[PDB]
Amino acid sequence: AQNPNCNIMIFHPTKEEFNDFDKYIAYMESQGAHRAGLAKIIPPKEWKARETYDNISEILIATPLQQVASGRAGVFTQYHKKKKAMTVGEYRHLANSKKYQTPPHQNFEDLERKYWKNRIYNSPIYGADISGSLFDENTKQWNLGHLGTIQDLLEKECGVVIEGVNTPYLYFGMWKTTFAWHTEDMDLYSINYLHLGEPKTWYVVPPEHGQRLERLARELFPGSSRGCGAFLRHKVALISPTVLKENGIPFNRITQEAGEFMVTFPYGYHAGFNHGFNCAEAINFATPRWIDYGKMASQCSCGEARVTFSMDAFVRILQPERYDLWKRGQ
Numbered sequence: 422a423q424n425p426n427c428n429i430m431i432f433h434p435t436k437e438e439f440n441d442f443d444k445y446i447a448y449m450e451s452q453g454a455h456r457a458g459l460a461k462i463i464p465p466k467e468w469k470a471r472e473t474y475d476n477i478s479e480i481l482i483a484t485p486l487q488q489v490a491s492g493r494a495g496v497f498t499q500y501h502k503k504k505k506a507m508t509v510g511e512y513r514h515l516a517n518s519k520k521y522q523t524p525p526h527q528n529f530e531d532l533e534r535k536y537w538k539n540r541i542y543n544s545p546i547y548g549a550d551i552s553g554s555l556f557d558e559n560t561k562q563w564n565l566g567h568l569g570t571i572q573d574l575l576e577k578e579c580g581v582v583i584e585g586v587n588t589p590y591l592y593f594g595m596w597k598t599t600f601a602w603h604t605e606d607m608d609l610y611s612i613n614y615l616h617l618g619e620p621k622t623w624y625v626v627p628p629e630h631g632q633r634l635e636r637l638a639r640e641l642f643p644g645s646s647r648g649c650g651a652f653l654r655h656k657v658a659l660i661s662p663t664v665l666k667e668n669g670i671p672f673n674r675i676t677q678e679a680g681e682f683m684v685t686f687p688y689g690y691h692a693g694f695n696h697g698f699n700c701a702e703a704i705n706f707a708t709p710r711w712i713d714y715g716k717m718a719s720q721c722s723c724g725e726a727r728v729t730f731s732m733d734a735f736v737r738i739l740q741p742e743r744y745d746l747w748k749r750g751q
């Protein structure tokens with residue numbers, strides 16, 4: 422078995438290897454990459470996502486979110502308080518202000534220490550799930566706006582016909598901006614490109630051990646768990662590496678820098694934080710290997726996880742027994 426210890430693997434495709442997205446995903450899996458739940462892809466040096474990021478300040482963040490924590494430093498939930506709209510230009514200036522700027526630090530280890538020590542005592546702002554793309558239309562390889570859709574994969578594998586069209590989204594982050602422990606909707610893959618700015622640190626649990634994380638989360642957030650078995654789909658819960666180690670949860674960590682892709686694999690739980698102002702782009706995608714994860718994916722039916730109407734047909738086709746209950750929660 423390839424990659425038995427479930428280490429996060431890093432790939433350096435050549436230009437020729439970068440010309441067929443699904444073929445290269447399959448190659449990474451032939452090397453065991455998916456056993457970690459996350460992989461890093463460094464594009465060939467000749468490739469470029471966009472020629473220049475001039476005028477990115479003109480993008481609108483219609484509903485910036487302030488991430489307010491409750492709990493202890495290593496075990497906390499966050500809720501989002503909505504803020505007034507601001508442009509990326511205004512957001513970047515706020516990120517670099519004295520209140521929000523990255524602190525002096527010796528190296529990544531030091532910064533990660535300061536994050537887990539101090540995150541709960543600040544409430545950073547960020548811009549999430551903004552439909553859009555920053556790839557140049559003439560970037561032809563690994564352009565997240567020109568991938569095959571999840572609907573076309575499902576139609577091809579199952580011979581069904583469904584509505585829906587999935588598109589990429591943008592994220593704007595600052596120091597301490599946080600993504601909570603989750604897997605993707607329907608346990609799909611995701612791909613994330615860091616366009617611009619400071620790094621993003623990721624934590625991941627191997628798919629073969631995701632239920633261990635679920636059981637710990639239920640123990641650590643009892644009230645949250647009671648309302649909904651699938652409450653990690655609410656994207657609210659954080660658990661530090663120190664607490665994971667203390668409870669024997671297997672995980673790994675890696676830092677993504679600008680110009681690098683990260684892929685998450687089906688049922689790979691992930692979480693992380695931003696080092697400073699940055700801009701990323703992400704989309705979900707599917708392969709033939711995903712179909713059996715989609716059929717088994719847990720669902721939130723309590724109401725809290727709102728998800729846009731692409732997901733209806735996925736529940737309807739793959740999980741018809743669960744559909745009426747899921748639909749009631751919507």
Ligand SMILES: O=C(NO)c1cc(-c2nn[nH]n2)ccn1
Nearest residue numbers: 592594599600604605606611701
């Ligand atoms: O919401 C997510 N996946 O469904 C998600 C969000 C992030 C994130 N990156 N920068 N800010 N947020 C990363 C991984 N996953």
Ligand code: NI
Nearest residue numbers: 604605611691
């Ligand atoms: Ni994610």
Ligand SMILES: [Zn+2]
Nearest residue numbers: 649721723725
């Ligand atoms: Zn729920």
